[PDB]
C-alpha cells in the first residue's frame, strides 16, 4: 500500500504560504530514498533522520506541509530562523525532526504579466508558534490609532502578494516547498519505509 506522495509533490496548484496545506499520512508504505534520488531539488535536508537511510523506521503519522515562497526565503524554512516567512507565515519548532524539500517552480507559478495569486502575511501582532496556521484577514493596527476595518494611515490589509514574472532574479522566482514531519505516539506505528 503506497503512501500518496505523488499527490503532495506533483499537485497542479500549491497553497499560499500563510494558508499552508497539510496532508496527514497514515497506513501506507513509502520509499523515501527513491524520493531523494531525483536530480530535481534545490533543497533536500533532514534534521535528526537521514534522507539516504530513511527507509528503515515506522511512525504513528507523517505530515506533508506544502506552499510557495520566493527563492530568497527558502533559508527561512529551518529551525531558529527569523523574517516575514518564519515569524508570520510558517514556523518550524527548534527541535524539528524531518525534511525540507524545495525546488524552482518558475515554469508553473510564473506567467506573462506576473502571477500575483501567491500571498504572504507581512504584518502580525506577534510571531506564529511552531506549526501554527493563521488565515485571518483582519486589518492590522500599526499605530496607536484604531482601524475598525478600512485601509488608511497605520491600518494595513495584513496579506500582500508575490509578483512572479519569468524575468525576475532567481531569489525572486517562486519555489515549491514540502516539509515532512515524522511523529511517534505511544500508539500503532503505521507509516513505514520498506523495512
Amino acid at each position, epitope marked *: 500500500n503506497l503512501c500518496p506522495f505523488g499527490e503532495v509533490f506533483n499537485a497542479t496548484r500549491f497553497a499560499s504560504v500563510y494558508a499552508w496545506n497539510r496532508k496527514r499520512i497514515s497506513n501506507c508504505v513509502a520509499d523515501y530514498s527513491v524520493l*531523494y534520488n531525483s536530480a530535481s531539488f*534545490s*533543497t*533536500f*535536508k*533532514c534534521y535528526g*533522520v537521514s*534522507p539516504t537511510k530513511l527507509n528503515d523506521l515506522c511512525f504513528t503519522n507523517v505530515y506533508a506541509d506544502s506552499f510557495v515562497i520566493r527563492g530568497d526565503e527558502v*533559508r527561512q524554512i529551518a529551525p531558529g530562523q527569523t523574517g516575514k516567512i518564519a515569524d508570520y507565515n510558517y514556523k518550524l519548532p527548534d527541535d524539528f525532526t524531518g525534511c*525540507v524539500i524545495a525546488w524552482n517552480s518558475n515554469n508553473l507559478d510564473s506567467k506573462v504579466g506576473g502571477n500575483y495569486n501567491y500571498l504572504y502575511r507581512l504584518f502580525r501582532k506577534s510571531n506564529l508558534k511552531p506549526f501554527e496556521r493563521d488565515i485571518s484577514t483582519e486589518i492590522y493596527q500599526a499605530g496607536s490609532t484604531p482601524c475598525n476595518g478600512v485601509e488608511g494611515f497605520n491600518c494595513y490589509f495584513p496579506l500582500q502578494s508575490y509578483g512572479f514574472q519569468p524575468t525576475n532574479g532567481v531569489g525572486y522566482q517562486p519555489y515549491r516547498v514540502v516539509v515532512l514531519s515524522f511523529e511517534l505516539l505511544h500508539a500503532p506505528a503505521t507509516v513505514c519505509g520498506p523495512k
Partner: antibody
Framework: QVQLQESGPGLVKPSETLSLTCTVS????????WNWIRQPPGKGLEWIGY???????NYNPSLKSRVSISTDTSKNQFSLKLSSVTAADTAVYYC?????????????????????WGQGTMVTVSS | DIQLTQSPSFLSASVGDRVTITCRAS??????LAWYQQKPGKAPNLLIY???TLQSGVPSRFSGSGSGTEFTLTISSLQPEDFATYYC?????????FGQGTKLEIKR
C-alpha cells in the same frame, strides 16, 4: 582535526585538462560539503566549485563550462577537472571543507565558511 | 553577483595598536560573513563566522561586528605574528565571493 591533502601534477600544457584530487583523513566525505578554491600568484581567492556526495554541484559561472568536481566515497576523495587551461589558470589550488551543517542532505540556499584547507598545490600552465 | 570591497587594502600599524578592517557588501547579507587570516605560503585560516562568532583556536584579540552591508574585523592589541593578508567572504548566496584582501604589515 580532519586533514586534506591536494595531489596531482604541478605542470599542465595549454588547452589540456588540469586534474587534482583531495584525499581526506580523520572524517568521511559523506559527513561534509567540499569546495575547490584557487589563488593566482600575488592575487586574491577565487571560488571554483562545490560538491556534496549526493552528486549535487555548484560551479563558478566564469569557469562553469570547463569545471567538473566529483567524489569517490570508497577512497575518501574528491576531485577537480579544469578543461582547456591557459596561463590565466596558473595558481595555487586548495581543497576545503565547509563547517558542519546541523542537517543531512543539501541546500542551494544555505552556504558555510571553510574551516579546513589543504596545504595547496602550485599548478603552472606552460608548454 | 555579490561584490565585497575591503578597506584599507594595505596598512602598517604598531604592536599593541587597535586595527579595524572593513568589508562592504554590494547588497544586504544579514550576518552571513566570514573572515580569514592568510600568512605567506599558507592556506587562509578561519577567524570569525556569522559576522561575530570567534572560531575555536583563535585568540580573543580578534573580534568581528556588523550586519547588512558594513562589517568590521577588529584586532585589539596587534601582535608581530598578526602580519598577514585578511579576507572577508559572504555566505548569503552562490556564487561564493571574497573581498580583495587587506595586507597588514607591522611597524617597529
Amino acid at each position: 582535526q580532519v586533514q586534506l591533502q591536494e595531489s596531482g601534477p604541478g605542470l599542465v600544457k595549454p588547452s589540456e585538462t588540469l586534474s587534482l584530487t583531495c584525499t581526506v583523513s580523520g572524517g568521511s566525505i559523506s559527513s561534509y560539503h567540499w569546495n575547490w578554491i584557487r589563488q593566482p600568484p600575488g592575487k586574491g581567492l577565487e571560488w571554483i566549485g562545490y560538491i556534496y556526495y549526493s552528486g549535487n554541484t555548484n560551479y563558478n559561472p566564469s569557469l562553469k563550462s570547463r569545471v567538473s568536481i566529483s567524489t569517490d566515497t570508497s577512497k575518501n576523495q574528491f576531485s577537480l577537472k579544469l578543461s582547456s587551461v591557459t596561463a590565466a589558470d596558473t595558481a595555487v589550488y586548495y581543497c576545503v571543507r565547509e563547517m558542519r551543517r546541523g542537517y543531512s542532505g543539501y541546500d542551494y540556499w544555505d552556504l558555510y565558511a571553510f574551516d579546513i584547507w589543504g596545504q595547496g598545490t602550485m599548478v603552472t600552465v606552460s608548454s | 553577483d555579490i561584490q565585497l570591497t575591503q578597506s584599507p587594502s594595505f596598512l602598517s600599524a604598531s604592536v599593541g595598536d587597535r586595527v579595524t578592517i572593513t568589508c562592504r557588501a554590494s547588497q544586504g547579507i544579514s550576518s552571513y560573513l566570514a573572515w580569514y587570516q592568510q600568512k605567506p605560503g599558507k592556506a587562509p585560516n578561519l577567524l570569525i563566522y556569522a559576522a561575530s562568532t570567534l572560531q575555536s583556536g583563535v585568540p580573543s584579540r580578534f573580534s568581528g561586528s556588523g550586519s547588512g552591508t558594513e562589517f568590521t574585523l577588529t584586532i585589539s592589541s596587534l601582535q608581530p605574528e598578526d602580519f598577514a593578508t585578511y579576507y572577508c567572504q559572504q555566505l548569503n548566496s552562490y556564487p561564493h565571493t571574497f573581498g580583495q584582501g587587506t595586507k597588514l604589515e607591522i611597524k617597529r
